[PDB]
Design an enzyme around this catalytic site. Structure first.
Site, PDB file in Angstrom:
ATOM      1  CG  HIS A  61       9.776  27.950 -13.582  1.00  0.00           C
ATOM      2  ND1 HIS A  61      10.673  27.566 -12.610  1.00  0.00           N
ATOM      3  CD2 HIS A  61      10.345  27.637 -14.769  1.00  0.00           C
ATOM      4  CE1 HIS A  61      11.742  27.046 -13.185  1.00  0.00           C
ATOM      5  NE2 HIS A  61      11.569  27.077 -14.494  1.00  0.00           N
ATOM      6  CG  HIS A  91       3.023  34.172 -16.068  1.00  0.00           C
ATOM      7  ND1 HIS A  91       3.511  34.861 -17.156  1.00  0.00           N
ATOM      8  CD2 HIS A  91       3.645  34.690 -14.982  1.00  0.00           C
ATOM      9  CE1 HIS A  91       4.400  35.749 -16.741  1.00  0.00           C
ATOM     10  NE2 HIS A  91       4.495  35.671 -15.424  1.00  0.00           N
ATOM     11  CG  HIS A  93       4.552  35.470 -10.388  1.00  0.00           C
ATOM     12  ND1 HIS A  93       5.727  34.787 -10.613  1.00  0.00           N
ATOM     13  CD2 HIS A  93       4.320  36.200 -11.507  1.00  0.00           C
ATOM     14  CE1 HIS A  93       6.192  35.110 -11.812  1.00  0.00           C
ATOM     15  NE2 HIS A  93       5.353  35.957 -12.378  1.00  0.00           N
ATOM     16  CD  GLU A 103       7.055  37.817  -9.602  1.00  0.00           C
ATOM     17  OE1 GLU A 103       6.942  38.274 -10.759  1.00  0.00           O
ATOM     18  OE2 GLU A 103       7.888  36.943  -9.275  1.00  0.00           O
ATOM     19  CG  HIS A 116       3.315  39.158 -14.323  1.00  0.00           C
ATOM     20  ND1 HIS A 116       4.424  38.584 -13.731  1.00  0.00           N
ATOM     21  CD2 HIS A 116       2.957  40.205 -13.547  1.00  0.00           C
ATOM     22  CE1 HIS A 116       4.726  39.278 -12.647  1.00  0.00           C
ATOM     23  NE2 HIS A 116       3.854  40.264 -12.517  1.00  0.00           N
ATOM     24  CB  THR A 195       9.821  38.760 -12.016  1.00  0.00           C
ATOM     25  OG1 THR A 195       8.855  37.796 -12.457  1.00  0.00           O
ATOM     26  CG2 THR A 195       9.284  40.185 -12.189  1.00  0.00           C
TER      27      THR A 195
HETATM   28  C1  LIG Z   1      12.482  34.605 -21.934  1.00  0.00           C
HETATM   29  C2  LIG Z   1      11.686  33.452 -21.361  1.00  0.00           C
HETATM   30  C3  LIG Z   1      11.025  33.840 -20.057  1.00  0.00           C
HETATM   31  O1  LIG Z   1       9.952  34.708 -20.360  1.00  0.00           O
HETATM   32  C4  LIG Z   1       9.394  35.465 -19.337  1.00  0.00           C
HETATM   33  C5  LIG Z   1       8.420  36.320 -19.672  1.00  0.00           C
HETATM   34  C6  LIG Z   1       7.799  37.170 -18.608  1.00  0.00           C
HETATM   35  C7  LIG Z   1       8.224  37.040 -17.338  1.00  0.00           C
HETATM   36  S1  LIG Z   1       7.538  38.053 -16.083  1.00  0.00           S
HETATM   37  N1  LIG Z   1       7.338  37.182 -14.744  1.00  0.00           N
HETATM   38  O2  LIG Z   1       8.529  39.089 -15.845  1.00  0.00           O
HETATM   39  O3  LIG Z   1       6.295  38.508 -16.612  1.00  0.00           O
HETATM   40  C8  LIG Z   1       9.306  36.079 -16.969  1.00  0.00           C
HETATM   41  C9  LIG Z   1       9.863  35.318 -17.921  1.00  0.00           C
HETATM   42 ZN   LIG Z   2       5.492  36.904 -14.173  1.00  0.00          ZN
END
Ligand SMILES: C=CCOc1ccc(S(N)(=O)=O)cc1
Ligand SMILES: [Zn+2]
Ligand SMILES: C=CCOc1ccc(S(N)(=O)=O)cc1
Length: 257
Positions: A61, A91, A93, A103, A116, A195
């Site tokens: 992802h 990470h 996006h 996002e 993020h 997200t």
């Molecule tokens: C609970 C496992 C997934 O963990 C996460 C952890 C952080 C995000 S995000 N994109 O909202 O920062 C998405 C998934």
């Molecule tokens: Zn994220």
């Protein structure tokens, strides 16, 4: 399995994750004129001096740079937060084109990408318990625009060749996430969610106003990653962003006038 394709993307997620239509979903559009300055908001305290990165993982992802979160080595506090939140991973996006990828949006503007930095509230003991709480996570979001290179990002860019496909990981020690921050820590904040599935409503979002600049070559390398596993049909890892969701009964607060 959920994803970002025509047949498994954000419009489908609600069928397996009904909270997708919940009351505090993320991301959102940040309407800068409607956001209200909150003079009671404290400055962010980003304490990453002792950060211990361990590994980088393509999870199908995005890619996560993971940290040792078994001690208070890299923590976020202050701002809207009560207590101490430990960095577990960061990470990004990003888009297929420079004109999309973030996002969150700002007055409907989409950035090329969004970083993020994910932290969990130490009062819940571990990340898995934290995501079950309304104040379990603090995610520091930073916009990326394409222009000059971000020197502190290059070590990440250069390892991506080794984690091209889903499920690949590589050692990634001694990376300093301080090199990914902009100069200013001015921010917007609001209560929201993960997200991606499971879309849990456990996040205090802190979105920095000042984007970082990365080069076209840097973002081009993000776009060479694959959603698929090795030996599967190649699908470029691009447009791994969820669009803005309804703000509903929420106010976005600004740390700055
Ligand atoms: C609970 C496992 C997934 O963990 C996460 C952890 C952080 C995000 S995000 N994109 O909202 O920062 C998405 C998934
Ligand atoms: Zn994220
Ligand atoms: C690996 C890149 C490190 O980036 C920085 C960038 C700035 C600082 S500070 N706040 O000490 O002036 C520390 C580390």
């Amino acid at each position: 399995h959920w994803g970002y394709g025509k047949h498994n993307g954000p419009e489908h997620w609600h069928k397996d994750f009904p909270i997708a239509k919940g009351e505090r979903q993320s991301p959102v559009d940040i309407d800068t004129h409607t956001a209200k300055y909150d003079p009671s908001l404290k400055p962010l305290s980003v304490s990453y001096d002792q950060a211990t990165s361990l590994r980088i993982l393509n999870n199908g992802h995005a890619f996560n740079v993971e940290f040792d979160d078994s001690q208070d080595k890299a923590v976020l506090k202050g701002g809207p937060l009560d207590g101490t939140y430990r960095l577990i991973q960061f990470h990004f996006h990003w888009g297929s084109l420079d004109g999309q990828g973030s996002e969150h949006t700002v007055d409907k503007k989409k950035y090329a990408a969004e970083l993020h930095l994910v932290h969990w509230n130490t009062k819940y003991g571990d990340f898995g318990k934290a995501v079950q709480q309304p104040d379990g996570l603090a995610v520091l979001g930073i916009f990326l625009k394409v222009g000059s290179a971000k020197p502190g990002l290059q070590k990440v860019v250069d390892v991506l060749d080794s984690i091209k496909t889903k499920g690949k990981s590589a050692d990634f020690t001694n990376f300093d996430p301080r090199g990914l921050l902009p100069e200013s820590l001015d921010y917007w904040t609001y209560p929201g969610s993960l997200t991606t599935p499971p879309l849990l409503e456990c996040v205090t979002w802190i979105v920095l106003k000042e984007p970082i600049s990365v080069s076209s070559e840097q973002v081009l390398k993000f776009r060479k990653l694959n959603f698929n596993g090795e030996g599967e049909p190649e699908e470029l890892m691009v447009d791994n962003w969820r669009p803005a969701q309804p703000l509903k009964n929420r106010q976005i607060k600004a740390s700055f006038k």
